[PDB]
From a paper:
In this regard protein kinase [name]—a cell-stabilizing EPK accumulating in cancer cells that apparently exploit [name] activity to escape apoptosis and to assist DNA repair —seemed to be an exception. Since in all known [name] crystal structures—irrespective of whether based on the isolated catalytic subunit [name]α or on the heterotetrameric [name]α2β2 holoenzyme—the activation segment and the helix αC obtain basically the same conformation which is characteristic for an active EPK. Thus, the classical conformational switches of EPKs are not used by [name]α which is consistent to its constitutively active nature. Previous analyses have shown that [name]α—in spite of a conspicuous overall rigidity in comparison to other EPKs—has structurally rather variable regions.
Numbering used by the authors: 3 to 334
The structure:
């Protein structure tokens, strides 16, 4: 028969308890300012397709960033704008400053606060053990906030995490794939980026929830402490599940598919093979031994689980002993 149902363990019904206007993004009507108010200064690298520029707000001469919206459905523009406005002021969420259009092209664009980011590739090579705990904790604050606001990010990855390393400031960006969580709703599995896709996406299980972002977060933790980046390096969506199964084990994969009555694409049986669940200690060697603590492995083991419902929530993750060194006492 069909796949078994599933529900988020936390924040499941929060959107139904809010006004419909909160989550009914198709009824949202943005106000499009004049993009001429922001003089572009330099282009900022965001892939071969997305066009993002640093600019100056000539009204107050403040640094901003302008993201020209790729030709996509207006429905998806409204979704991203509504989600950004619902999340504005949240901890470590990128602040949407303005929604503008170019007077000539009429192309919609988003204006964000500027953060003096350093690209993760060079940053990951110099992060200390404390840096990893600190920035993972700051990222967890953003994920717990947006989940508590009934929103899945669905594209968590190092490229979408701006870090001002000198100011110790972090922002979660790129909410163009984010969605509102509603219990029993089936979602598109063609989300996130290959290396950070959870097993539910790869096996085409559509009734997923906030725990998808927690798998992606676990992949980032694994690449930071083990220094293998990305940690699961699939050549495509099919091979990506094999890379996961070579670590978590194939028998545990089949146990997950049986629990939720998930039909496996038979092509996976051509490439999966049989693999035991590996101990996380097997990935330690001289180049990463200084970053792989007992609590780091215990947290990673509780994040990188096939069963999305058994993964730690963002809040449970924040309460894990791994973050004890960075849990600050209440101010004032
Ligand atoms: O799509 C989005 O939601 C989105 C949001 C923000 C940014 C964004 O990128 C930056 C980059 Cl790539 C480099 C630098 Cl040096 C600074 C910034 C920055 O300040 C900034 O806000 C990019 C995309
Ligand atoms: Cl606005």
């Amino acid at each position: 028969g069909p796949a078994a149902g599933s529900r988020a363990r936390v924040y499941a019904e929060v959107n139904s308890l809010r006004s419909r206007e909160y989550w009914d993004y198709e009824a949202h009507v943005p106000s499009w300012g004049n993009q001429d108010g922001y003089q572009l200064v330099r282009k900022l690298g965001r892939g071969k397709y997305s066009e993002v520029f640093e600019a100056i707000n000539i009204t107050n001469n403040e640094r901003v960033v302008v993201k020209i919206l790729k030709p996509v459905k207006k429905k998806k523009i409204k979704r991203e704008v509504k989600i950004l406005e619902n999340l504005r002021g949240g901890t470590n969420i990128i602040k949407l400053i303005d929604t503008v259009k170019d007077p000539v092209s009429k192309t919609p664009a988003l204006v964000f606060e500027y953060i003096n980011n350093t690209d993760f590739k060079q940053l990951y090579q110099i992060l200390t053990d404390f840096d990893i705990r600190f920035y993972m904790y700051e990222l967890l604050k953003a994920l717990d906030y947006c989940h508590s606001k009934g929103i899945m990010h669905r594209d968590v990855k190092p490229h979408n995490v701006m870090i001002d390393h000198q100011q110790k400031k972090l922002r979660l960006i790129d909410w163009g794939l984010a969605e509102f969580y509603h219990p029993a709703q089936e979602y598109n599995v063609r989300v996130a980026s290959r290396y950070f896709k959870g097993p539910e996406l790869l096996v085409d299980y559509q009734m997923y929830d906030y725990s998808l972002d927690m798998w992606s977060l676990g992949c980032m933790l694994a690449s930071m402490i083990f220094r293998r980046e990305p940690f699961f390096h699939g050549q495509d969506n099919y091979d990506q599940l094999v890379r996961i199964a070579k670590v978590l084990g194939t028998e545990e994969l089949y146990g997950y598919l049986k629990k939720y009555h998930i039909d496996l694409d038979p092509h996976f049986n051509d490439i999966l093979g049989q693999h035991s669940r590996k101990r996380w200690e097997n990935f330690i060697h001289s180049e990463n031994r200084h970053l792989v603590s007992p609590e780091a492995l215990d947290l990673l083991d509780k994040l990188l689980r096939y069963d999305h419902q058994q993964r730690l929530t963002a809040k449970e993750a924040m309460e894990h002993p791994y973050f004890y060194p960075v849990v600050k006492e209440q101010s004032q």
